[PDB]
Every structure is written in structure tokens, then in C-alpha cells.
């Protein structure tokens, strides 16, 4: 009975749901040549979180726990804690801790630590290799490559803050990260579990509409494109509103609030993704004050006006 809606926020006022950075732009392109199955930024229109999705954008791609030095290296194993420092529970029916990275790549940031007895602190450059055989956040373990073999203490609270991505070469620039390749959450040769499903346009002439950011790059020639299916603020809003879906497809209009002019229309599917009627790769040109407006629940045969 509660009416459905989407927030009155512009694209630039919103946040990527797959990495803690603002949205920049809207992009559409074909996606039949890869699997689109991100686990962050997944939520139904009536407020059910999916995959590894949680509510605040600052927790995405962060890790916390205690660390142990890996002998012969400058690397450390982190034994993951919950976000609130309670024990991690590996038995919950999720793919990995909520907010775990959902792509294969090298995420560079800073590993910080506080010694509880005197409040002394330290911080070091650190990279997590989410395509590594030993990356196993579902089992409670990840490793960080750092610039020290001696400075981090055992049994002291340690945090990783993500900054950006790196690339170390290949046959071409921009060969990594691979934003549509899921990690193996329990390490090499394991089954991922409890995934949010892959998404694809089912209606002829339609493509996914992506909410796009550019991840900072920290070294090399990385592919910094990062597309999410829902802004983080839409996840937060649907969770809060929990308005029942009256059909499987919500018709949205993208509107200029100064003129009331509709720039394009699109479909917001109840399971939490957007499609437009377009063929090809296209960067949308929008007024910066434009926003999305829910206009009607529609049936399964609605043809959108060309984007």
C-alpha cells in the first residue's frame, strides 16, 4: 500500500555501491559478452539486500582484524573480525563478509594499527590481491602486501582503508582490474555461495543502464571504470522505504527540474537493476541537476522510448 518512489538526488549527489567514491556519470553498453553478477550494490525495490550488500558506502572494500607476519616477506595475514570487532561468523548465508570486494583486481590502500596499551599508532602502504590463491575472506583470511617486515604487532586492532587500484603490466594497458569477474571468496578451487544472481536485459533492444565512477589509480595503467547496478543511496532508500512492488517493472523518467523536460525513460526491475532502449556503447549527456522520477508500475510488454 505504501507508494514506491526513488530519491530526488542527482547522479553527482550519489555514491558508487561497489567502491567508496561518488558517482560521475551514466553509461550504457552491450553486456552479452560477459557475466554481470556484482555482489555489492544489490537490493530489491522493496528493500531486500542481496549478495554482500550492506548500507553504508564507507565500509565497502575495508577490512579489520588482527595480523600475523608471513616469514620471509613484507606481507601479513589478516584474521578478519566483524566491522564492530566481534568475532567473524563464517556460517552466515552470504558469499563473504558484507562489503567484501566483488571483483578480481589489486586494491591499494593503507593498513593502520593501534597498540591498545599506550595508544601508539602506525600505518603502511598495503595492497590486497583479490585474484590471489590465498584471498579467502569467506573463510576469514586475507593477505596484505606491505612495505614492512617488522612494524605491525600481533593481537592488536588493524584496519585496511582502500584508496584505488593498480596494474603491473600485460599485453595491453587496462587489462586489470576485471570488474565483472567475481573473486573466489574462499580461495583457489572453491565454490562461491549465496550469490545475488547474474543480470541481463531480457527485452528486445534493451541494454543495462550502469551508474559509473572512475576508481583512483595508484600505479600502472589500470582499468579504472567501475559500474554499479544501483546507486548506494538507492539501496539505502529501498531498505528504509520497503514499498511493495506492484509489478515486476517500475517505469522511471529522468527529468530536468528547471524545465520539467523528460530526457529519457528507463525500467527499474523489481530485483534491482535498470535497463534502457539503446544499442551500442554510449556515455549519456545529462543536465547536472537532473534526477530520476518513478511514474508508473508497468507490465512485461512495455516498450521504452528510444534513449
Amino acid at each position, epitope marked *: 500500500t505504501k507508494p514506491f518512489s526513488v530519491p530526488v538526488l542527482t547522479v553527482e549527489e550519489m555514491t558508487n555501491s561497489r567502491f567508496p567514491i561518488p558517482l560521475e556519470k551514466l553509461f550504457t553498453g552491450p553486456s552479452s559478452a560477459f557475466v554481470v553478477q556484482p555482489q555489492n550494490g544489490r537490493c530489491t525495490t522493496d528493500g531486500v539486500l542481496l549478495g554482500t550488500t550492506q548500507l553504508s558506502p564507507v565500509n565497502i572494500c575495508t577490512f579489520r582484524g588482527d595480523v600475523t607476519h608471513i616469514t620471509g616477506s613484507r606481507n601479513y595475514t589478516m584474521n578478519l573480525a566483524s566491522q564492530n570487532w566481534n568475532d567473524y561468523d563464517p556460517t552466515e548465508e552470504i558469499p563473504a563478509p558484507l562489503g567484501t570486494p566483488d571483483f578480481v583486481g589489486k586494491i591499494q590502500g593503507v593498513l593502520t594499527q593501534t597498540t591498545r596499551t599506550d595508544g601508539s599508532t602506525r600505518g603502511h602502504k598495503a595492497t590486497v590481491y583479490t585474484g590471489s*590463491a590465498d584471498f579467502a575472506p569467506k573463510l576469514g583470511r586475507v593477505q596484505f602486501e606491505t612495505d614492512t617486515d617488522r612494524d605491525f604487532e600481533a593481537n592488536q586492532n588493524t584496519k585496511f582503508t582502500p584508496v584505488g587500484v593498480i596494474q603491473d603490466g600485460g599485453t595491453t594497458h587496462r587489462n*586489470e582490474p576485471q570488474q565483472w569477474v567475481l573473486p573466489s571468496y574462499s580461495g583457489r578451487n572453491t565454490h562461491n555461495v549465496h550469490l545475488a544472481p547474474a543480470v541481463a536485459p531480457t527485452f528486445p533492444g534493451e541494454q543495462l543502464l550502469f551508474f559509473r565512477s572512475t576508481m583512483p589509480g595508484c*600505479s600502472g595503467y589500470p582499468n579504472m571504470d567501475l559500474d554499479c547496478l544501483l546507486p548506494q543511496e538507492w539501496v539505502q532508500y529501498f531498505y528504509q522505504e520497503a514499498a511493495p512492488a506492484q509489478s515486476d517493472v517500475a517505469l522511471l523518467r529522468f527529468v530536468n527540474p528547471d524545465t520539467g523536460r523528460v530526457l529519457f525513460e528507463c525500467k527499474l526491475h523489481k530485483s534491482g537493476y535498470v535497463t534502457v532502449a539503446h544499442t551500442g556503447q554510449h556515455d549519456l549527456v545529462i543536465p547536472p541537476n537532473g534526477y530520476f522520477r518513478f511514474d508508473s508500475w508497468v507490465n512485461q510488454f512495455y516498450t521504452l522510448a528510444p534513449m
Partner: nanobody
Amino acid sequence: QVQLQESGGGLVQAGGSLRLSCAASGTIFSIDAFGWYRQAPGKQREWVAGITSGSSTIYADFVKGRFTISRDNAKNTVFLQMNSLKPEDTAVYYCNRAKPPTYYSLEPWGKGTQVTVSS
């Protein structure tokens, strides 16, 4: 768990040869693809050569037939035979698990091995 250990670097004169070795453990060596990479001070790290589990090879544009990557599954070792060396090849060289077809690396790095080519 994964370990990568390079050896065989050294100082050589322009036009000389080196043979690099890389000992890899912690994986199923025979099903992995491997790559060689290099980085000089103040420059970006770059890929040099790759080899599939089938022992097919592929090289960066600057190799120009002078280097040969190979593998010995029996010994869990990858090799880079380096001929006709030039000063532009000076760098720390590293081996890693790699993902074909573009050969991005997968693991934290080993210590690498220094190659220095005098003019």
C-alpha cells in the same frame, strides 16, 4: 602460502646474456600460467613474457626475439633466457602467476632479481 623466488640476475655488458630462474610453490604448478615482469627505478612495472600451462609463449613488443621463456614442471621452475641485452633492459625482474590472454599477475611479489646492462 604462494612463494616466488627469482635468481640469476647480474651485471653484464651490452650484448651479453643472462638466464633468470623462478621457483614457484604453493600452487598446482602444472595448471598455472606464468609471466615475467620488470621494473626500473622511477618507471612503471611492465610485463615481459608469458607462458601457458601448455608451454605456448608470447612476448612484449620490446623483446624482439631476444628472450625465451620456458618452464620445467618437474622442478616447478620458470626460466627467462635473456640474449642480446641492452642498457634499456636494466631493471629488477620478477616472475608471477598470470592470467592469460593478457597476463596480468595474480600474487604478491617475490624479491625479484637485478639485471644491469652496462653500455
